[PDB]
Design a protein around this ligand. Sequence first.
Ligand code: L7F
Ligand code: L7F
Lengths: 304, 304
Amino acid sequence: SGFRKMAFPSGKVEGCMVQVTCGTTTLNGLWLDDVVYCPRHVICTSEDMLNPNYEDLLIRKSNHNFLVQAGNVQLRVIGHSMQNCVLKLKVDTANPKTPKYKFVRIQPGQTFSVLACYNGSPSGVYQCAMRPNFTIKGSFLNGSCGSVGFNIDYDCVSFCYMHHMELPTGVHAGTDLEGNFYGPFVDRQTAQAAGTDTTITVNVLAWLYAAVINGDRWFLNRFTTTLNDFNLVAMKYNYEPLTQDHVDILGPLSAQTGIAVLDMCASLKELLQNGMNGRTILGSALLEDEFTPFDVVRQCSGVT
Amino acid sequence: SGFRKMAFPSGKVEGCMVQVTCGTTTLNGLWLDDVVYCPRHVICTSEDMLNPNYEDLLIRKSNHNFLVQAGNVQLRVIGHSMQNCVLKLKVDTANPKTPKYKFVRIQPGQTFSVLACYNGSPSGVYQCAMRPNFTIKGSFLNGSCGSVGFNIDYDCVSFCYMHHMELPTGVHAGTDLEGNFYGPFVDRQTAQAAGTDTTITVNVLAWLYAAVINGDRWFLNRFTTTLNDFNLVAMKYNYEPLTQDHVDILGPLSAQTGIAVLDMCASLKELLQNGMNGRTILGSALLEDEFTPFDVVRQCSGVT
Ligand SMILES: Cc1ccncc1NC(=O)C[C@@]12CCC[C@@H]1C2
Ligand SMILES: Cc1ccncc1NC(=O)C[C@@]12CCC[C@@H]1C2
């Protein structure tokens, strides 16, 4: 028992972290096989940042200008290319620590662990969610660009995120491992509108099930609701509309606990309308939305 | 910017995790040099659990009865001994993945990362605090015993905790790496009183500084207080009494932000007396106490 915002063990990813320098800029790179991936803004200087001409800047760079260091050793760069907003530096040595891996594009509302790095060195690991508006509320300082987000299924690391930018609002933006930004963001030092965010309803429901499994039951009530009635409340409180697909994914939790998904929806409805009344659920005084139904099952059963 | 409940990267600890079996029981062990450490209750059966005679049970066990597996390989046990509530199994092979390490006894109120494991395999990593009453509110299921708590200073892992038990209340109890329980707990399946817990005041203050550094400022006010006046409020709200030693440790944060520690104490006093008024601080709707002043400085500066 007990429920925590658990991150995946970061070992397999730590062995992939390298430092990438180009001119004055140093950031993090991801070394997999004989390729190092990093944000393309490593080639910029402060004068470029407002609106960099990435193709033009990269043309002034040669393989020898990209300094790649895996802690103690220097990697020899034999090729460079820009794919979307990432640079792929072909090195002459395959990373001996390369785990089984996949590059995946996650959906908004899904969760992942971030291994925050500085100068190719890991400082910490935290679990977070891709917001419905494609931003992440992370912890990133200058130098952390290139730090990656990932999930682990047994021994295979699915890399889903690479950090690129902090918006003027202090929220974070990044790309998949093919360099495509999540959301409407561009890698420029400009004010950029992030979409209207919403709370990930399916995740809040999954977390309410985790609470029941672990003893916090005070919020359970004598009521039920419908998808339509619940979605009217979710609309008012800026929550993601719940669909039968979300009800379906909550099936194992509904089955384990015997609490019908719509009955849990009714508990959520009363919590949205009345608040917590100074009480807590799993150590939180708000409705947590960074645990997917998959995260709840995995943690509640001991999946390694 | 951004502030997260960050855990240390778990790589160095993952390479130390092994599986220990004795009879029907399987739990986790920590392999450092040529020694495997694990909770001594691995030698019990359900009939023993109410009040095991550990010395008597261990006498019925030989080196060959302790099955130690480091994932793929079986370790040869050449010695066994019980030190307090831990068993130390001498193996014929030193762990090639042994990092620089220390065994430390942490103080209540200090924080650390837990690498939750099952059958010698890591499932996740989370940051937590040793409560003033020596319990930890973790996430541990059956089989997680032997999972360890630790801190990392550059390349040296300081192991501070080994998980042993879940109290009837669902709170967790464990030992240092010499097998000494934190708190008054004994490794028996009995109801055991945990002391009256309190909120770690110095940590809440450190977290209020992290909030200011990262933009959340609404709670700052036109007031100041004294240690005596503040401690009267802390007494009423079951918070740890603040001392000049705590004020001293908050020095770097007071210096960085220009907010005198007693002025921050006055903001905390008003938050205790009035609540959050439906607002949040760093994504939380309560006063967070799992970040030490050291954690705040490390995270706010990018220490790897
Ligand atoms: C300073 C910082 C802190 C945390 N996370 C990211 C950053 N860096 C940036 O945002 C750099 C830029 C803006 C210009 C193009 C390139 C993305
Ligand atoms: C079942 C479980 C779940 C999570 N954390 C720990 C446990 N296990 C125990 O508490 C076992 C005992 C009680 C008897 C002696 C030995 C400590």
